[PDB]
């Protein structure tokens, strides 16, 4: 039965992560107690719940949760992509290899973006930051403990991007036109997640997720719908041009100006290392540099997008 098994599992590449996570899940759920005193609970749930309220703190359990979700997201990817996406793609009749392997990779981006796009907006609805209200991101800066959902969104996405950064290092094969600006993209997504989560500017990180997800969802939607026959996918290009414009540009130009202007005159602006509040005159350069790098790459994608808009329309 054995080498039939490696061939079987060579084909499919979701089976090993599925086995790992089903074993962990089963062992956690059949042990009876599901309280915080386990070990599987440190890995299969957000730790740190403060008392019996809904505000969770930070620690190393967070790293354990992030790593176990790397394991879970890999399986997802592979399961999904191969099982549903490959099969729907080859129902479709668009049949080839630059076009199908690349429609397939788009196809999984719209899946996850629909899930993350709305999770994030939903998470900022139940809060004080509604429709990117900057006053709120800092009105209470240290934030040593965010909420449940919000902590989960934050580490669910570190779990998701980390793993993708690790998959593009692992060196799959072919980048081509991009991998350079896209690697800038990956590394900066990961430093902002890590930085912001760990220095307590989490309510800064929440708005930017909303912009990236809601714009990238429509981007990948247009790319898939174009990769297939078009019909209207050009209505998805208008829509993505305006989602992208409003969201990434205006959205973040207003958050970046929020950073100069209201990092200063909001919250507590003394360095005070003992209270662990670093909102001062030193961290303002670092924050501005990070979001400025995001805005640079986004206008670089805006030049690609605007070159394509007059190009395509006028050729």
């Amino acid at each position: 039965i054995w080498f039939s098994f490696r061939e079987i599992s060579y084909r499919h590449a979701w089976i090993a992560p599925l086995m790992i996570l089903i074993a962990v899940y089963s062992a956690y759920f059949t042990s009876g107690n599901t309280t915080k005193t386990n070990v599987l609970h440190r890995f299969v749930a957000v730790s740190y719940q403060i008392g019996d309220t809904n505000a969770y703190g930070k620690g190393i359990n967070d790293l354990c949760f992030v790593f176990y979700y790397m394991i879970f997201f890999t399986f997802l990817r592979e399961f999904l992509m191969d099982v549903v996406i490959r099969p729907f793609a080859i129902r479709l009749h668009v049949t080839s290899k630059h076009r199908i392997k690349r429609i397939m990779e788009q196809m999984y981006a719209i899946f996850y973006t629909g899930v993350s796009g709305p999770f994030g907006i939903y998470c900022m609805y139940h809060s004080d930051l509604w429709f990117f209200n900057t006053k709120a991101m800092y009105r209470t800066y240290p934030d040593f403990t965010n909420p449940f959902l919000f902590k989960v969104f934050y580490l669910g996405q570190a779990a998701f991007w980390a793993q993708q950064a690790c998959i593009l290092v692992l060196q799959l094969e072919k980048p081509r036109k991009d991998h350079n600006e896209l690697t800038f993209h990956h590394i900066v997504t990961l430093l902002l997640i890590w930085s912001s989560y760990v220095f307590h500017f989490t309510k800064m990180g929440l708005p930017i997720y909303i912009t990236m997800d809601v714009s990238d969802f429509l981007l990948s939607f247009s790319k898939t719908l174009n990769y297939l026959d078009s019909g209207l996918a050009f209505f998805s290009f208008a829509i993505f041009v305006v989602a992208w414009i409003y969201l990434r540009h205006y959205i973040n130009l207003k958050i970046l100006w929020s950073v100069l202007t209201q990092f200063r005159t909001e919250g507590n602006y003394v360095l005070n290392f003992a209270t662990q509040q670093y909102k001062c005159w030193i961290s303002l350069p670092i924050v501005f540099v990070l979001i400025g790098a995001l805005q640079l790459v986004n206008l670089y994608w805006l030049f690609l997008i605007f070159r394509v808009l007059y190009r395509i329309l006028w050729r």
Partner: protein, 132 residues
């Protein structure tokens, strides 16, 4: 392929931990980032310690920097020092104006030795004198 992956996984984790140690490390000992120990030498080996900083130099920070200076600038295996730490009570625990005319200090210490122990005893009007 894979080596590259594991090597990047270990620098990222090294730097995750390096920054966690910046937070912890600068938090447990912040008395040096915000408080600057000013010592005013008296007649002999007696010097008067205090601290001067921003609003982040609370009475705890002043006490830690005074203690650090007393136990790090004087070697009691040569000869023995004898110091008193004097609190200023007409002061809230967070009292330094962030600006530049600070005001009175929270904790004032007169450290000394033993060849001129009498001088320290006399400068420490009624506060307890600690021998090391």
């Amino acid at each position: 392929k894979i080596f590259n992956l594991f090597r990047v996984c270990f620098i990222s984790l090294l730097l995750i931990a390096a920054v966690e140690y910046f937070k912890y490390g600068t938090r447990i000992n912040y008395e040096w980032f915000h408080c600057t120990p000013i010592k005013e030498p008296q007649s002999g080996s007696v010097i008067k310690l205090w601290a001067r900083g921003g609003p982040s130099c609370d009475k705890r920070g002043e006490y830690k920097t005074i203690v650090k200076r007393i136990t790090r600038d004087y070697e009691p295996n040569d000869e023995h020092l004898s110091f008193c730490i004097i609190e200023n009570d007409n002061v809230p625990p967070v009292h330094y104006p962030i600006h530049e005319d600070k005001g009175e200090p929270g904790y004032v210490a007169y450290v000394g030795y033993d060849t001129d122990s009498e001088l320290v005893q006399e400068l420490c009007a009624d506060s307890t004198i600690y021998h090391m």
